[PDB]
Amino acid sequence: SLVIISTLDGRIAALDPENHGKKQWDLDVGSGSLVSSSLKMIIPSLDGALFQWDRDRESMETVPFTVESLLESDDVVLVGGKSLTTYGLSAYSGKVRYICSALGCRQWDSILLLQRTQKTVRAVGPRSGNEKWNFSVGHFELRYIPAAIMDIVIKVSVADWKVMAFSKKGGHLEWEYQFCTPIASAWLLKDGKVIPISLFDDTSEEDIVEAARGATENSVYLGMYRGQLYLQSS
Amino acid sequence: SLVIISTLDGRIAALDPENHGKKQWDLDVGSGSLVSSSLKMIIPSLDGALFQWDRDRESMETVPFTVESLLESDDVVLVGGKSLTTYGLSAYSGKVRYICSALGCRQWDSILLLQRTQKTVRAVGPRSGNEKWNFSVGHFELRYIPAAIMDIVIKVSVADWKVMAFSKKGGHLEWEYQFCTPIASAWLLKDGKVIPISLFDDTSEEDIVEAARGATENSVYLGMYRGQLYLQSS
Amino acid sequence: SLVIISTLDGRIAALDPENHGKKQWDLDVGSGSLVSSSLKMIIPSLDGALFQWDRDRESMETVPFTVESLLESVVLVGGKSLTTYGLSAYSGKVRYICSALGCRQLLLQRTQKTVRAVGPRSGNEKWNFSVGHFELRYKVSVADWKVMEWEYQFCTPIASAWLLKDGKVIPISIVEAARGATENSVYLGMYRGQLYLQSS
Amino acid sequence: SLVIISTLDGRIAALDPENHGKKQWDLDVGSGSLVSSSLKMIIPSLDGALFQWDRDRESMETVPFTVESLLESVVLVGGKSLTTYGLSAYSGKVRYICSALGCRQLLLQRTQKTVRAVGPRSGNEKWNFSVGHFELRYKVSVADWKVMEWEYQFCTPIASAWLLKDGKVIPISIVEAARGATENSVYLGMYRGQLYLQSS
Ligand SMILES: [W+6]
Ligand SMILES: [W+6]
Ligand SMILES: [W+6]
Ligand SMILES: [W+6]
């Protein structure tokens, strides 16, 4: 019945789409932020990809490595790993029912499944652990087991950190929520089914080339979060 | 000593960078064009990737398939394949010394290696070969076996189908060549070493975000060649 | 009900399991045999994977390359083919044969992989590998070359074997029992002229 | 010169090949054994690949999944670890141990893969798989559990075996000869408690 938003700080918000977008539960689990880096320059994507931004040539080129691909592996040594943990949430209210991971489950006793994937790669230089650098990305995947809702459409502005509800009868604003950190994901949970909300939407010969070029720029976001440059794309 | 340009018609030009960019050899081998398609809509990239352009949402999303990945494989059947043939050219003059492929070499008797890769996938619907659709991409890779030249820099304009030489002493135009078809690749062959020429170049806080966003749009080209929409990227 | 048999020379024979073993049809498609080679002896497979042998060492060990992953870059050429030959179930009669260039007007899907090293300056071949296997959707003794009331013999060694029935398609072939199963689970024969592995 | 031996319980012993076989050091790193499991019997490997067995069928056949490719999506959890434990060559003495969270202040690189199925509603584990192998850069009888003048016995079964010498690191272990090599080229033992495959 509600809306789930995954921000870059690694947190999960949940809004009741009627009337207010009034927050119904926040879930902060310490897990870090959704993207990290120590150390032209390399820009991590939310997926796990890295991109090389040459500042001298004004170019962005794909490095042929991933955080995972680096783990497959001169002078340095690669460490790190990929993890999958699932949080059994009680939608709604709250809450954590369990935290399931590789070494064990952590249960509380008393319908929303929330999986965090985390990929870390740390480059260390022998004969020591002085860490020459690292990259670490993460994201949430969501499942419920018991478009947009009728009367109201839900959109998401990446560059504005805003979720918004518009009436299909007027297009006008019904409610709005501003977040204090960049948005990485957004799901609309409705009548049992989980529905992913796109971050990239605009709606109301050599013509269609511009239309398709207009489309290709519309489908990439480059943001900054607490000093970390990252890259969202489709 | 010269410059090699691979166009979308599947041809290979070669220019003497001094003084003129005067063409020295054209190589037309029937092999088709560098990208083809029969049949929202799907846009092939030069690599082999496909992209889905939703015209209603003004969005470009990655399909999780490649021309090769489709071959790995309901109602339809996939056929096609990937081929690697090498043309032993005589740089310079001309020419073909041999054409080496899977089933055999085709020799002439009397220093430039030119490999064409070709990826085709055809979707056919049983019980017949009426071909529900197809995609076919190709590209050239170049090797010589016996930046830019001194005094002169070589650049390439994708959207203008132009190769250009500029003096390092003034930045001014030394010579220029206009092609009649979109450019897919460009190599600068100099003193034994083969040097790939980038298709994307411009040269002369929240600041660097725009600088890096300016960079990320600079590194993608969406063109059209004889009706076929394609996509160049880094 | 029909019995389709993929031989290791590239041709496809069909038998009637109606207490005959008689051949109703047999198809040769000029793509070559399922295994080819050239001039530390190494052995390929149906896949095609690659394996390295020496008679002094006790072992057979994987080479970190495949025919395919060699195409992804001495000069290497070749490629991969996916061709489906449409048959009418009984007595063959190819209806459509669609390859990469286009379709010519029970379907046998023929995969072929080929890599050859050639002299950069000359073009002269240094060595090669060609691997293929059949797939076609609508008890055999691999020791010798027979399918078994009734039996049937080849020329050439067997590669794959399916049994059609009613429309459905069926292919067929303490820790001691476990290890014993692993033993008789890989096959290494000869063709011609060359060692080949049939995996599992 | 040193002899480093990776046992199948996760610990690493070193022997002096100076006509002793004596243990100079031995390292246990709490990451678990190299193979774990849970409750059509299937068998994993060091990689870790997965294989399916039934005592009625003559065979051992690949399942189209790995511990890793199951992580890439009953509910599945777990992950993959890459940890390198820096040792001083003789007598161990771990200098640095860098995992994904950070480095704590001859290097053993420990890979671990883990997948477990859990009940969606409950969280209760349904089954799991854990696979690990050691790698560390700066004649053994796998039949029994010994390395051979002098010999040495384990508890537990052997997984990998290297021989250090002068600085360099060396690990060691008609068509009849070919097929014979393929035979004694895979190992299927028991631990504990579970069948495991050591590939090649
Ligand atoms: W480095
Ligand atoms: W379709
Ligand atoms: W060689
Ligand atoms: W099950």
Author numbering:
A (entry chain B), B (entry chain B): 104 to 142, 152 to 185, 190 to 226, 235 to 270, 303 to 360, 371 to 400
C (entry chain A), D (entry chain A): 104 to 142, 152 to 185, 192 to 223, 236 to 268, 311 to 320, 330 to 354, 374 to 400
From the paper:
The unfolded protein response is an important cell signaling system that detects the accumulation of misfolded proteins within the endoplasmic reticulum (ER) and carries out a cellular response that attempts to rectify the imbalance. All three proteins have a luminal sensor/transducer domain that in concert with BiP is vital for sensing ER stress, an ER transmembrane region, and a cytosolic domain that propagates the UPR signal (Bertolotti et al, 2000; Schröder & Kaufman, 2005; Ron & Walter, 2007; Zhang & Kaufman, 2008). In an attempt to shed new light upon the mechanism of UPR activation and to rationalize the differences between Ire1 luminal domain structures, we determined the crystal structures of PERK luminal domains in two different states: one state is the previously characterized dimer arrangement as seen with Ire1, and the other state is a novel tetramer arrangement.
An optimized human PERK luminal domain construct encompassing residues 105–403 was expressed and purified with cleavable N-terminal His-tag in E. coli. To overcome this, we used a tungsten-derivatized multi-anomalous dispersion (MAD) dataset which yielded a good quality electron density map, from which we were able to build the structure of human PERK luminal domain, and subsequently used this as a molecular replacement model for the mouse PERK luminal domain. The human PERK luminal domain structure forms a ring-type tetramer architecture. The individual monomers are arranged along a twofold rotation axis forming two sets of dimers A–B and C–D. Each dimer presents an inward-facing concave surface that intimately locks together at both ends to create a space in the center of the ring tetramer (Fig1A and B). There are substantial contacts between monomers within the tetramer interface, with the key feature being a helix swapped between monomers; such secondary structure swap motifs are indicative of a transient interface (Ali et al, 2006; Czabotar et al, 2013; Tan et al, 2014). The salient feature of the tetramer interface is the α2 helix being swapped between opposing monomers that results in a total of 2,500 Å of solvent-accessible surface being buried, making this interface more substantial than the dimerization interface. The swapped α2 helix resides in a cleft created by β5–β7 and β18–β19 as part of the tetramer subdomain. The interface comprises predominantly hydrophobic interactions with a number of hydrogen bonds that also contribute to the interface between monomers. The electrostatic potential of α2 helix is positive while that of the cleft is negative. However, analysis of human PERK luminal domain protein by analytical ultra centrifugation (AUC) revealed a significant tetramer species that exists in equilibrium with dimer in solution, with a dimer to tetramer ratio of 3:2 (Fig5A).
